[PDB]
Design a protein around this ligand. Structure first.
Ligand code: MG
Lengths: 467, 406
DNA sequence: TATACAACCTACTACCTC
RNA sequence: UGAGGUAGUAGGUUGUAU
């Protein structure tokens, strides 16, 4: 017999100073935080891709309904939500012919084909950025399904320095120019026409169309420079940081690159959420612990960024990771940290197999239920049942996060509240919440993009150039 | 009379007034405000007076710090009071408190007595209150699906949990009784101290120069005092032991290895085949082992179309926070009742297809049935090392103070 | 240098639903 | 890669003794 505590659902701040718990409800009822006047889009691909993009953009403007609106709120139209214009009349189209695609698409090798396709798609972007007089907010790269299927690291042809992934290499090669691009698939916007066996579409968006519209609109609005929502219950000068380690694979010797994501509250009552980059490297294979010098450099850079943004030093700095810090790297961390600042290192994992089944009901466990094992351990149900939407966020019994304070002293309830609030800042999607904290997820995205190339020297901190 | 008149300070309270007017129009009502419906080139004060006198059925008054002593708002309020007196309608004037900086003692007396609607905390809760008041007062409304959807969204936006206790069943099998002590046998003889380490009938692994086991020295005679230390289990579970002979964490690792080996060997003798995974091992029952695959009416083993699926349990002992066994559930597909498939992709795809229509109730029922069938007595089952460890067949329970009502 | 395992780590798919 | 979730398949590291 054990006791579970309940963590109150956090709120996110929308326009007019109004708070809500659901991003879709707050965006439909109130609207985004900031006002940008319009979105000018640049489309790349074949003429069929342009027609598909124009058709989807025209379809977006009118309201779209889901099959069951009690779980997925309907999309009321882009202008009726974001009070800004994203139309098909402001499209700067760059043409990519099928012959050019097929010149390198059907050729041999997996690294050369992807490199050539990425070069063909990216030279147009660079030239139109430098040698054209039209201002483009977001560049929408429509990729035919053949390129998506045939540009995987483990892909095999159907019997006739850079990563083999099309998306990661494409985003890495575009870092020196700071061009926010959204990669779309033809089957994503034209799912109704990509049938498989007897006219049945490969992907069924019939009952989802509203949610797809919500996600696409939110991503486009964020990449264009808009602020859809912000956290309302952020604490004092405390700063949250998150470290994620990645393998640089067979590029240049066994190496591990660590990338960080940073969040805090500025003096303008908003939220600063960017990335600490310059992936710090470790030459030892299989070790995910930062060397002392690189750890000191990381903490010094993050502290300097916070001091420049605010004007003083943070009261306490929380650190999240999927691994457990050792003593040497923690001592290196503390050597730089000022006395007034309190260092807390927290480890969040999703590996402990603790499944809770409801005794009678057919639904899963309520989201937010927490099992405090002891002072420095807890099990948090970030994914589960949400009373507002009469369905769970998972399919089977969800797995809970195992949050354990590795280093330093801090209240476990406060840590759980901070993590549950951090899980609300996913701008890559318009959902209720996600299991993983957004800091770790965005550090994951940043690392998996920055590990796809080696020519990057000073990567940008903003998130619109990665997500 | 179907209009809803909205009064406000025009150059200071436009945002909330426009928001409320558009929301009310979207819900099927007909509203009148001077920022959206006043015409150009018209005598505006006479038009406002005529609208108040002959058109409005309700009079919403945005009461804030700006409009508390605004002359136009006061004139409209006075005319509204006269019209309410003529109409004998007590609920004609509804003040909406949208400002938290307006003290209760500073509100003008004409609307102090009236029951306002709180908009300071949240505009959505205030809109819900407005909708409830309008529905109760039978305010005329002329809507078709869009209005209903918006109304449902506004009502449901604030849905939350209820403080009702609930009981959750986990998948952790707790440990009740541990053996008297952990045995270290300093033999070093008997074929390089039992060089097999993987064939003895009772669980045991080799330490530096000792064998760690809960069994006696005269029990491995089929495949094969001076036993020192002999640490008790109760004293070492609390982690109060030290010294250079063996570290406490290494002791915990040794004992958890012992329970894992015991769990493997005990029910490897149950004449039940197993499945090999990437990192662990899972064990599923055969088609003919159960008569007839309905243990406690739980439908343990079935078939999808022509392939037979089997429920499997994979167990592993752990000591953190306190000694229990974590057991997980899997689904394994075989063409026949007793066979195996080497196609990993087909097995995975069919498993994902089978797991899409089970849900929490079926998962818990099958898990409990499998864990009850593996039992050896009324309320537990024992593992053998000449000693025995009793493991409860009922998983531990969790209590929550909040829940929902479907 | 290999065993064996306890305790952790990432990389890459296939599937289902929002 | 519109986005999450749950699985499966692989490899690696540390420590404990030979
Ligand atoms: Mg995205």
């Amino acid at each position: 017999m054990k006791e579970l505590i309940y963590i109150e659902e956090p709120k996110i701040l929308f326009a007019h100073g109004q708070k809500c718990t659901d991003a879709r409800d707050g965006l439909a009822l109130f609207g985004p935080l900031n006002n940008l006047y319009g979105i000018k889009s640049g489309v790349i691909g074949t003429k069929q891709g342009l027609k598909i993009f124009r058709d989807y953009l025209d379809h977006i403007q009118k309201p779209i309904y889901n099959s069951n609106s009690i779980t997925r709120p309907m999309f009321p139209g882009f202008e009726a939500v974001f009070d800004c214009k994203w139309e098909s009349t402001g499209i700067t189209f760059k043409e990519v012919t099928n012959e050019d695609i097929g010149k390198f698409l059907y050729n041999s090798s997996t690294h050369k084909r992807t490199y050539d396709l990425v070069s063909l798609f990216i030279d147009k972007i660079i030239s139109a950025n430098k040698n054209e007089d039209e201002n483009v907010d977001v560049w929408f790269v429509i990729v035919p399904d053949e390129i998506y299927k045939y540009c995987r690291p483990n892909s095999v042809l159907p019997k006739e320095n850079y990563d083999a992934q099309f998306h990661d290499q494409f985003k890495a090669r575009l870092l020196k120019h700071t061009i926010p691009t959204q990669i779309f698939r033809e089957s994503t916007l034209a799912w109704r026409d990509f049938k498989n066996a007897f006219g049945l579409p490969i992907r069924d968006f019939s009952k989802i169309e509203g949610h797809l519209a919500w996600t696409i609109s939110t991503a486009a609005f964020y990449k264009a420079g808009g602020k859809p929502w912000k956290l309302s219950d952020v604490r004092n000068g405390v700063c949250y940081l998150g470290l994620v380690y990645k393998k640089v694979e067979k590029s240049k010797n066994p190496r591990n690159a660590c990338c960080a994501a940073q969040m805090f509250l500025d003096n303008g009552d908003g939220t600063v959420f960017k990335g600490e980059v310059g992936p710090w490297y470790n030459p030892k294979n299989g070790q995910y612990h930062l060397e002392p010098k690189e750890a000191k450099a990381l903490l010094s850079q993050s502290l300097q960024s916070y001091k420049e943004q605010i004007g003083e030093y943070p009261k306490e700095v929380f650190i999240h990771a999927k691994t457990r810090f050792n003593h040497q790297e923690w001592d290196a961390f503390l050597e730089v940290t000022p006395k007034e600042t309190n260092l807390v290192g927290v480890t969040i994992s999703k590996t402990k197999p603790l499944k809770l089944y409801k005794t009678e009901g057919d639904y899963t466990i309520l989201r937010g239920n927490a099992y405090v094992v002891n002072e420095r351990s807890a099990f948090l149900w970030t994914v589960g049942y949400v009373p507002k939407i009469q369905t769970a966020l998972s399919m089977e019994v969800p797995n809970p996060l195992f949050i354990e304070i590795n280093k330093g002293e801090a209240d476990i309830k406060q840590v759980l509240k901070d993590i549950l609030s951090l899980t609300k800042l996913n701008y890559n999607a318009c959902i209720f919440a996600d299991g993983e904290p957004v800091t770790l997820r965005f550090a994951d995205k940043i690392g998996e993009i920055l590990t796809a190339s080696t020519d990057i020297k000073t990567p940008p901190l903003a998130f619109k150039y990665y997500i | 009379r179907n209009k809803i008149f909205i009064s406000h300070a025009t150059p200071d309270d436009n945002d909330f007034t426009r928001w409320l007017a558009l929301k009310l129009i979207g819900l099927g009502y007909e509203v009148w405000c001077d920022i959206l419906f006043l015409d150009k080139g018209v005598d505006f004060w006479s038009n406002i007076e005529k609208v108040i006198r002959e058109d409005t059925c309700k009079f919403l008054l945005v009461s804030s710090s700006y409009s508390n002593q605004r002359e136009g708002v006061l004139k409209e309020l006075a005319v509204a009071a006269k019209v309410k007196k003529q109409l004998k309608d007590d609920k004609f004037i509804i003040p909406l408190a949208i400002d938290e900086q307006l003290s209760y003692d500073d509100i003008n007396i004409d609307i102090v007595r009236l029951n306002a609607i709180d908009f300071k905390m949240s505009w959505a809760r205030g809109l819900k209150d407005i909708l409830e008041a309008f529905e109760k007062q039978k305010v005329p409304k002329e809507v078709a699906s869009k209005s209903n959807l918006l109304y449902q969204q506004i009502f449901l936006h604030d849905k939350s949990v209820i403080e009702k206790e609930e009981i959750y069943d986990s998948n952790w099998l707790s440990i009740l009784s541990f053996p008297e002590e952990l045995r270290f046998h300093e033999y070093n003889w008997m074929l390089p101290k039992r060089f097999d380490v993987r064939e003895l009938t009772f669980p045991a692994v080799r330490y530096k120069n000792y064998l760690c086991t809960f069994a006696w020295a005269y029990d491995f005679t089929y495949h094969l005092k001076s036993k020192t230390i002999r640490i008790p289990t109760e004293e070492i579970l609390s982690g109060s032991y030290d010294s250079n002979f063996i570290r406490n964490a290494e002791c915990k690792r040794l004992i958890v290895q012992l329970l894992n080996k015991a769990f493997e060997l005990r029910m490897k003798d149950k004449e039940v085949q197993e499945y090999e995974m990437s990192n662990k091992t899972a064990y599923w029952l055969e088609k003919g082992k159960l008569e007839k695959d309905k243990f406690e009416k739980t439908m343990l083993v079935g078939k999808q179309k022509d392939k037979n699926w089997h429920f499997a349990i994979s167990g592993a002992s752990k000591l953190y926070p306190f000694p229990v066994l974590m057991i997980s559930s899997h689904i394994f597909f075989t063409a026949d009742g007793k066979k195996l498939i080497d196609s990993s992709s087909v097995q995975h795809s069919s498993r994902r297809r089978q797991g899409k229509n089970w849900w929490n109730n079926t998962w818990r029922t099958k898990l409990l049935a499998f864990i009850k069938y593996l039992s050896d007595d009324d309320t537990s089952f024992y593992l053998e090392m000449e000693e025995k460890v009793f493991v409860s067949n009922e998983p531990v329970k969790f209590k929550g103070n909040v829940s929902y009502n479907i």
